[PDB]
Amino acid sequence: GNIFANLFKGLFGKKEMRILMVGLDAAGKTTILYKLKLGEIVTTIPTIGFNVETVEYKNISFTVWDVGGQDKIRPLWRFQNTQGLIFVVDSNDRERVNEAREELMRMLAEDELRDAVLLVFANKQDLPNAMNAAEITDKLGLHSLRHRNWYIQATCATSGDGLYEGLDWLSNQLR
Template sequence: MGNACCNCTNLGTSPVQRKIILLLVGLDNSGKSTAAKGLTGESVEHTIPTIGFSSIKMKHKGFDVIIYDLGGGPQIRGIWSCYFSDVYGVIFVVDASDENRLGEAKVLLYNLLANEKLAGKPLLVLANKQDIPNALDEIDIVESLSLEPLVNQQKCVTLVEVCSALSPDNNEKVDSRLVRGYRWLVRQVISNYDELNRRVEHDMKEAHAAVLLQREEWKKRRSSELENKQITSTNSVNKTIESLPPVAETNGYAHNSAKFSHRIKNQVEMDRHKNKKSNKVFPGVIKDELPTEGKANVDAVREGGSMTVRALTSPPRKTQGQANGDRSRPFTSKSLGNTDVKTWGLGEELTLVDTRSAHQVDSPADHVEYLTNGTAF
């Protein structure tokens, strides 16, 4: 995601739009998605909790403004930091009617601004739900969040704006205080655009390099794990051979050890398949990852066939009596033709199950090209 320079032109015709990305965060149920919808002019009547991430796009003068609306639930907050490098400013939404959760909101905001990728970036705090009786005003919110020392310490230029994202006064389509706050934030970014843009580009490059490094390390670890597995399985075949009756009892194969061990290996292989009931299970590898979605190339599945891909939360555990079974808990699963695959666990072991027992997929690792950077949605 590069950011274009304002003086460049696109094929000499229209000027390239500059981009401003804003982070919209806060506790779950604070009204982030309602505020985002209000800003775009969408109906704010029905919102559901955001599971993961959604983005909205708007225009402001010569800029494309993209708002990353992130789910505020405790299990989703873990992914927030993946987006910090990209953003030019932050909108933090507080439910001003819910005093019980202000302490939690304060800790959250403190941790956000302490992050080096966000410190120093402009901040808009929306004290939302002002339509609810006894909602705290901006002075109370500043105090409850201990905002002043925090933003001074992190050098964030800040505005606190009260608003009601759901039911604005005067039957306006969107609360004008919300729009005022948003415009203030965009103006702040624009007034310091060059510096913020340099910082974003630098941080994004760094984040990208870190992902590549992580991926390389993971691939190395994975291939050495696979090598070890190979050695273990060869050893187990050799042990089976060693434990067989003396050569004299094996009719006809006594003097042909190569043929003999071939027969034993086949036997081991046949037993393995017998134990697998109807499905054949092949351990596979996630070979690559993409930020949000990827494609699985499953050419090996024959026409009319189907394949289920499962990403596992943990490496397969084998217990006694389940010699060939994969006993891991699936993270998620999806049936595939040659289709897109979404939201797989990064770095997780993958098992491909050919649901038609009659057909075999030779090596699943060869057939899965991309999988996603997993986010536990």
């Protein structure tokens, strides 16, 4: 195809589009970048510990980096004109959603990512102990959020179910 490469057209034109993709460790943001098949993934290490991967089909830039971490996860992170915020959650991790909630809530508070559409990918939906979207949507309190227009597509990066269905949404929103 590139069934994906294609959802992003119309968006094609001289100012840079930037889509942020962050989430906790093991949410599957990397499998997401790769299945997306939009060019080859370039890793950079902007400041010690902050491993930032990136991809780019013309003017749509997909910047990705982990959050909620290790010892100090940081400033340096204070966002140009990022119009899309994709936040990915490991559905099988019941323990950590709460952190996934501190991290969704902490980033959305920022000035910079202010008018930035929220697409969340409820990810490991292929495991018998899965947490459905509705459970993910309460456990993250996206129904209180009285500003952003958001969305949560259940997926399975690995085989890629829901990616086209969740990205038709972001696309149109930014459109």
